[PDB]
Amino acid sequence: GAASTNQLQYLQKVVLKDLWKHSFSWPFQRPVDAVKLQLPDYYTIIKNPMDLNTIKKRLENKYYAKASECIEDFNTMFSNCYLYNKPGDDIVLMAQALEKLFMQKLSQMPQE
């Protein structure tokens, strides 16, 4: 509705910024370079990859029609991490910390 622009700017200026500032954001900032990381199965398992810079550019470029498409992308980024890796892997514990912060930020999103 009329608050969609309000919610998308919150996702860009608060949610994305605060996740990026988090010490654990580094491995999620750019697409996984599966050649450099020697992960030849990564993009066979992860058919719908997502990363913070892709979300950042989609927000800047007004790619989203509503904030829910953006939330879906964040959700996919976290879910993909838990899918490819094992419970308890370092990257999974990093993602879980970021997801916890993400859900706090969502709980404070304006209802204007």
Side-chain angles (χ1 to χ4, degrees), residues 1 3 8 43-44 46 57 60 64 66 78-79 85 105 107:
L8 276 167
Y43 289 114
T44 304
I46 300 306
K57 260 84 189 164
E60 295 165 354
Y64 302 116
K66 135 74 173 161
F78 291 119
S79 294
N85 302 284
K105 299 300 178 163
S107 77

Side-chain angles (χ1 to χ4, degrees), residues 5-112:
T5 285
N6 203 17
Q7 293 190 340
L8 276 167
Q9 214 62 210
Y10 180 79
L11 283 167
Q12 183 194 55
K13 295 192 188 166
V14 178
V15 182
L16 175 66
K17 177 174 302 148
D18 287 347
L19 279 184
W20 204 296
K21 203 192 161 13
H22 194 292
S23 302
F24 297 175
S25 76
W26 184 87
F28 307 95
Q29 283 176 13
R30 297 168 69 212
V32 167
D33 173 356
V35 175
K36 186 152 141 223
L37 298 181
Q38 310 167 343
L39 307 170
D41 295 286
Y42 185 83
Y43 289 114
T44 304
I45 296 158
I46 300 306
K47 189 186 163 293
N48 301 290
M50 188 55 51
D51 62 280
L52 293 173
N53 196 41
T54 296
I55 292 165
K56 177 184 202 100
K57 260 84 189 164
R58 290 179 166 190
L59 288 167
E60 295 165 354
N61 292 332
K62 200 79 156 64
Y63 169 93
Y64 302 116
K66 135 74 173 161
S68 67
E69 302 162 70
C70 181
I71 290 153
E72 149 157 20
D73 280 351
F74 278 106
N75 284 348
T76 295
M77 179 185 76
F78 291 119
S79 294
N80 284 344
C81 183
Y82 309 142
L83 186 75
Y84 179 74
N85 302 284
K86 285 153 91 292
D89 286 350
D90 295 331
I91 188 72
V92 169
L93 302 176
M94 291 176 78
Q96 284 169 345
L98 292 172
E99 191 180 7
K100 181 174 200 106
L101 178 66
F102 176 63
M103 298 175 57
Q104 301 181 351
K105 299 300 178 163
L106 289 187
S107 77
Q108 302 301 305
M109 189 204 310
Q111 303 274 290
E112 308 328 299

